[PDB]
Design a protein around this ligand. Structure first.
Ligand SMILES: Nc1ncnc2c1ncn2[C@@H]1O[C@H](COP(=O)(O)OP(=O)(O)O)[C@@H](O)[C@H]1O
Ligand SMILES: Nc1ncnc2c1ncn2[C@@H]1O[C@H](COP(=O)(O)OP(=O)(O)O)[C@@H](O)[C@H]1O
Ligand SMILES: Nc1ncnc2c1ncn2[C@@H]1O[C@H](COP(=O)(O)OP(=O)(O)O)[C@@H](O)[C@H]1O
Ligand SMILES: Nc1ncnc2c1ncn2[C@@H]1O[C@H](COP(=O)(O)OP(=O)(O)O)[C@@H](O)[C@H]1O
Ligand SMILES: Nc1ncnc2c1ncn2[C@@H]1O[C@H](COP(=O)(O)OP(=O)(O)O)[C@@H](O)[C@H]1O
Ligand SMILES: [Mg+2]
Ligand SMILES: [Mg+2]
Ligand SMILES: [Mg+2]
Ligand SMILES: [Mg+2]
Lengths: 46, 255, 259, 255, 257, 253, 253
């Protein structure tokens, strides 16, 4: 039928995804490079 | 306390009945004709109840929204939800003891009837996402210009709808019935209406017109009496003008 | 203050006396109620009152019931405050809230819901109302204006009109002189409208009208009293042109198929 | 158990049948006129029933609309619910092992009817995927004042589902038909209201009150009983003066 | 700016009507079309929109009849926030359509008298009939109309109130009846026939058989928006006679052979 | 007893149903008002090779959430808020086995056309995971015959149902069954007595049995169970044979 | 190749197919006077496969009875506006098929309002969104099919005759079951082969002239689908490639 703003209604990136997408927000060449160096873990990542 | 006094034996009887019912917080209704000051009567009663110094705010049945019906008497949680908002009290909590008259009660749906039938309990309020019910019982009263007996004859008013009321219905004299303070009531109404009109004091007031007015149905008893009074006051607009041949019969065409 | 009536539609028959009474009522703060043919001076009367707003700053707010959303316009009726109906945001002022102190330029739209009638009666009881979802209402003030075209007493007798509607309404009646009735400035207001039509159409000068033209004008009731006559005049500005126009009456009924 | 209105042979037999049904966890039906309180009787018998100390469900019929058992009876307790995710209690899940009473169950829609039919057919309707079952251990109860006999004959509810929802239908006879508990209720209410209305004493139903009651059809029965109780509270007269004109009909117009 | 449309309209009365439109071009007042369904009412409307628009002038040819939902037309009345399921999002909608232009309605009878009177309160005054801040947008907008219903008939329906029909009416344009024009009928018929012979890229135009032309003239074709063009495509279905000229008129598409 | 004894003709039909159980063909089923056509379906599913596979039976067309047909396959939660989408769905739950429908009766004409088209062509797609439809393993529909569609034409869009002529199964009346009805009643009574922890079966007058046999059995064995329950509760004792059997709890005295 | 599904030995069917091929090479509107079962959706596939743009996506399958709200949404949607059922921008739009063509079915169900919207799109593609300015057009031909005597419907004024005229650049009568009788036995054989292969039956063990006569006497009110799934049920009744189906019951009803 018609629509209504009020109803039983069934999100936004938080923390981890924030820094993740910031790597995109940061430049990949150098701005992301410093963070990638700061990783210093996940040895299973060549 | 500063409302129109009926100045009738029936009016005095009704005043006494209201005085007797003042402490009674039991459910009630204003039978007769709403829009003839049953609202003012209930309000002044709320002023003078046992809870004279209490929070009283009446309400009309036809007011709120069908979707917002659940949000009418109460409030929804909606913590991490679409309509996210704080714990809201809502009406049946917002009053909590005083007089929240059931106005427009004749203007209700069967769904609102079910809501009231739930409200037949003294509080025990379950909200949207609520954990535990709360008992908010208050001084209860309504209004009905309609004959609930004829309503149940039509059946739209449920038998329980009648049952919700907890008082024997006090009835007031209709226009044809009352016709007691008509001259004096007209005099007070004219005092107010001319105080509005700011015209010079009426040198003319002939009671023959009042008598002929007694020879009228006056369906808007409390309203239309003073209404036609002030309308004739404006149309004539003259201070030295006797109450003669002046009438607000808007149905009648002028000549 | 005193302002030149933007229009000059006066029908000297009784609309002169009507205007006198309207001016008398103009300072008053009671309900403003009118009745008469649409397309006939009555919305013009609304303009008259709106300019006739005592002092200034009175919001000449007009809301038409037919110009609304059933089961939805309620959110805009007494106001909106909370989320999930006004798009969250702030306390969203309703049509009533949009005009506090201003003119309630209502016309008797005769919308199907007597529920709308009651909802207005809820607004028009004591100058008090509440935005949507508000636990606290607001007692306010606004100028109130009404205009009609139909026998409210008949519909109430027919039960079609809420007795409570006309009750909370109708501080007093205001009817109008029909074009079949007024008949005062037929040629005069005709000349005024033709003057406007010429100022627009940029023809050389007033073409003029024959006596048969005024004869048919008297023969016409002009169902749209103030307007249908203007329709005739406007169509007269069309069809033939220049000053040669004079006889052959005028173009009154567009709906009338050509002979 | 609890202070009870009505010890008649019919009322006593009702108590006996309540005792018999108290072990019987199988759903059954106690029919009777509203304004009586067969639900309170069901509560007392439940205290006597299998759940001697167990949960209890009021469950007024038309208290949920557009709200499935999943909305309220089942709830949204687990994560990943509608809107932002959190815990949400559910009635039909909450009160297992206690009492599950359905108030005004005759007031029912077809959709909720189809829901409860499967709930009965499966022990509970369960939630989400059709692979998930459920059962509810609460003492399932229900009642109203309507003779569904014609409602199913009209098809307002599924006749087979109506047969399923209970194991033994029992109907409370009219108190007006009894008309003997008239005096007992009169006296009990007199004492209770003298405690309540703070009267010096109970006036007592004088001869005219008894005669009128004998003539009274008493359509409301226990509802009419409390009605007459309030009516006599209006028609107090004097605590010494026995009440001959005890009843007070709101519809009537005096003088 | 935009020229009125090319249209084979050899009916001299049609030419007079075109001249009337030319007169109305600078004019800024309502226009009605009393043209038949299938009388190119929308077509002349477009010609008018271009001509009177006269400076990149916007037009709007929409039917709220197509707006099947009440809430749909309600949204067509702009809302700023909480608009149906929407909540606090902008929606210019049809108001932008008429912004700096006019309104052209095709068979506007479907509108409720509620919708009709909504439009009536909009027409003369113009302030924004939309949920907006002060809703004050009396945009520079004209309007024009087109329907086949009769005014007394509408009064019987009452869907058009008195002031509705009136403040609706400032001009009226009854398209020449499809039964009226006879020579111009075959004229536009040949025009469309050539248009088809070209666009179909058929190397040969079949022309027009005299029996076929006479039948087309006798064909009532009261709808002739493109029902003429429809029958044209009907004969184009009986193609392959591009070199030839053999009559084939499709009377009943439901009927076969 | 707890199983489906079934009448002789009902036994032959049960053999046919257990055979068609391996046939994973989509089906539409009809049982009586209180016949209980579900238990035979469970027995068949056990007899079907789909016995090991999931057999999610429709939940009476329950209307939880707004996914509805997208309830057949939907998403759980956005990753940023809550849990992963986790590919949970209704049309997916009956995975590797049977798939039973329920409350097919209640539907209107539009959803009837929708179901007919789904029969003609079915696809399953969800914002959360999901998997291709057009499999519908061991599909079977049931409970549609409760509310007939297009009986005199019209009603729901059952013209395609006339077109969609996959095999169907009727339901004889319990009165027309002529099975070991007294035996089934006795079995139910014994089960109840165990549940009731009753002393013993009080017995039943064969005259009472014949008198109770004077009944249309409109709820079929469900009516039998209800009447037995009422009659036993009225007996409320294991002492003497039940010369009374419950006609209807709706009555007066 | 479109599989030549239900290859009609009827000569009128052949002429209809020839017209179908000619129009499918064309990209112009057309109507199909045919019934459900009487070529249920088959001609839509014929159009899609023989589309003037074969790469041009012709989804077809418009035998879609959607609620007035549902159908209107299927036509048009709004991003971040109303439309409680869906979310954000509505890719669901009749423009879902560009390069191909657009068809309608169950068209008799179209409201005069929906019919008007459709005719408007047919004349000019615009305003196809509940939100925003939609002057854009997705190029596509037009076709439809409904079984109603729409001349009466317009005589009843049931819907917009404007679409009824504009779309009907060719209205194609289509054959019900009663139309094709010579091809009846051959189509039965084709369906039987399809079933035996699908049912893993090596073949039908034998066909009785009595069986063929009985099947022909058994009408097919549903032209194909009723007959087809009736054959499905009848084969299930037979179920044995070794056992010929002389009187395999077509349908339970
Ligand atoms: N007994 C009376 N004497 C004088 N004036 C009265 C009397 N009753 C009512 N009025 C006047 O008529 C009006 C009645 O309105 P009101 O009684 O407030 O309506 P309601 O109470 O039904 O809402 C009041 O404004 C009051 O000025
Ligand atoms: N007495 C008059 N003299 C000249 N023009 C008039 C007169 N009365 C009405 N009109 C014309 O009528 C139009 C106003 O229409 P109006 O009656 O206000 O519409 P509505 O009835 O909807 O309020 C103006 O354009 C004006 O030219
Ligand atoms: N045996 C009884 N003893 C005391 N009070 C009773 C008795 N029977 C009925 N009542 C009164 O009647 C009322 C019935 O209430 P309730 O059971 O809620 O009605 P319903 O079941 O229709 O909602 C109760 O408030 C109770 O005070
Ligand atoms: N001069 C012309 N030559 C050929 N065809 C025309 C001409 N004018 C209009 N048409 C055709 O008439 C059809 C209908 O136009 P019209 O009646 O304006 O539609 P509407 O119903 O919206 O008014 C159009 O499809 C157009 O192709
Ligand atoms: N032949 C049978 N074998 C086992 N149980 C049966 C048999 N006939 C009936 N029943 C019982 O009858 C009950 C009917 O319940 P239900 O499935 O709701 O019936 P229906 O399928 O008619 O709606 C079932 O719970 C089932 O246990
Ligand atoms: Mg106006
Ligand atoms: Mg209760
Ligand atoms: Mg058009
Ligand atoms: Mg069942």
């Amino acid at each position: 039928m018609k629509q209504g703003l009020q109803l039983r209604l069934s999100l936004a990136m938080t923390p981890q995804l924030q820094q993740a997408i910031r790597l995109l927000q940061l430049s990949t060449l150098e701005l992301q490079q410093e963070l990638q160096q700061a990783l210093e873990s996940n040895p299973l990542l060549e | 306390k500063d409302n129109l006094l009926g100045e009738a034996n029936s009016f005095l009887e009704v005043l006494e009945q209201v005085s007797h019912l003042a402490p009674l917080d039991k459910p009630v209704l204003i039978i007769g004709e709403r829009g003839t000051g049953k609202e003012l009567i209930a309000s002044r009663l709320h002023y003078l109840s046992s809870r004279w110094q209490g929070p009283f705010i009446s309400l009309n049945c036809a007011a709120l929204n069908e979707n917002l019906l659940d949000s009418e008497l109460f409030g929804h949680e909606a913590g991490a939800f679409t309509g996210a908002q704080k714990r809201h009290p809502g009406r049946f909590e917002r009053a909590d003891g005083g007089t929240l008259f059931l106005d427009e009660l004749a203007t209700a749906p069967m769904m609102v009837q079910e809501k009231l039938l739930r409200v037949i309990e003294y509080g025990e309020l379950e909200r949207v996402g609520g954990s535990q019910p709360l008992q908010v019982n208050v001084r209860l009263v309504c209004a009905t210009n309609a004959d609930l007996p004829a309503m149940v004859n039509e059946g739209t008013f449920r038998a329980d709808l009648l049952d919700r009321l907890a008082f024997d219905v006090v009835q007031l004299p209709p226009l044809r019935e009352r016709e007691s303070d008509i001259m004096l009531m007209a005099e007070y109404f004219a005092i107010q209406m001319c105080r509005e009109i700011k015209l010079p004091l009426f040198p003319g007031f002939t009671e023959r017109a009042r008598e002929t007015l007694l020879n009228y149905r006056w369906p808007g008893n409390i309203r239309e009496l003073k209404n036609v009074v002030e309308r004739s006051v404006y149309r004539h607009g003259t201070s030295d003008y006797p109450l003669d041949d002046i009438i607000i019969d808007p149905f009648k065409r002028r000549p």
